[PDB]
């Protein structure tokens, strides 16, 4: 026997609708997470300060993620970047909302790290993961994307765009590179190593 123990939110209520009821577009995870942040803001359930947009990438923009819908099985998808929502519940128990995972929606942090992320120990160093964590309030206020990165040079869509107008602010219409970048000298939020990330939010 082992005691898995602070306070565990055993009665946790999701901050989102059911997976299938959520606004989702394949290859637009930055916008899928943005829409979850907007839903949490307009819903009177959880404070926005408890929620974070998490960008996963690296210098070479080649990161493995396991348990992904786009590739069923034991092998990973190699993304240029991926975005999930992190909810740190009042007690300190963390939950991951990833609309692209075959793990539960939402999923306990430790379970998502264990099965989806795994250790960088025996991973080829060029594939190792870094994490930019942005408060959901700061993500909604500062994030802008004109979707120019999803068009070819001829101007045709690589993947069908989301069925609503481009997200913009007063300050910018495109700053997506400042979020995907894992340079701590650019952008909003904090950039973490895997060990720093798993420690901060993991039990």
Curated annotation (Swiss-Prot):
It comes from the Eukaryota. It is found in: Cytoplasm, Cytosol; Nucleus. GO terms for cellular component: cytosol; nucleus. It catalyses: N-terminal L-glutaminyl-[protein] + H2O = N-terminal L-glutamyl-[protein] + NH4(+). The keyword Nucleus applies. It is an enzyme of class 3 (hydrolase). One of its GO terms (molecular function) is protein-N-terminal asparagine amidohydrolase activity. Its main location: cytoplasm. The active site is at 29, 82, 98. Keywords: Cytoplasm, Hydrolase, Nucleus. InterPro entries: N_Gln_amidohydro_ab_roll_sf, NTAQ1, Prot_N_Gln_amidohydro_ab_roll. GO terms for biological process: protein modification process. Mediates the side-chain deamidation of N-terminal glutamine residues to glutamate, an important step in N-end rule pathway of protein degradation. Conversion of the resulting N-terminal glutamine to glutamate renders the protein susceptible to arginylation, polyubiquitination and degradation as specified by the N-end rule. Does not act on substrates with internal or C-terminal glutamine and does not act on non-glutamine residues in any position. Does not deaminate acetylated N-terminal glutamine. This is Protein N-terminal glutamine amidohydrolase. It comes from Homo sapiens. The gene is NTAQ1.
